[PDB]
Amino acid sequence: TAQAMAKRHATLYGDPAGQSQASRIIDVKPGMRYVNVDSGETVAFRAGEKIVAWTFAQMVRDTSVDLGLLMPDLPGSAGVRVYIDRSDL
């Protein structure tokens, strides 16, 4: 599937995480434009009662990705940009 391809591309940016492990919850709202996350940060993203969390990978350069690539089932995710900061490692 195209979903399998997308899942593979999303892996470049980290891995799904349990919600319990996030250090903050970001509410995904209409028109928010973007968020900023660090390499290694675990962030939960919430739309109503749905919550999906993610641990970002160690990026070799500052990069960005569409939240809808990482969490297509989260309402409102598509079009929100995630800027991920380069790893200090």
Given Mg ion, its own copies, Cu ion, none, residue 29, with its beta carbon under 5 to 8 Å by kind, binds its own copies
Backbone angles phi, psi at 2, to 5 degrees: -70, -20
**66 is in the binding site of which of Cl ion, Mg ion, its own copies, none (Cβ under 5 to 8 A by kind)?**
Cl ion
CB atoms within 10 A of CB 79: 13
Query: Which residue has the closest beta carbon to Cu ion?
Result: 9
d(CA 23, CA 69): 21
Which residues form the interface with Cl ion (CB under 5 A)?
A: 24-25, 31-33, 35-36, 50-52, 59-62, 65-66, 71, 73, 86
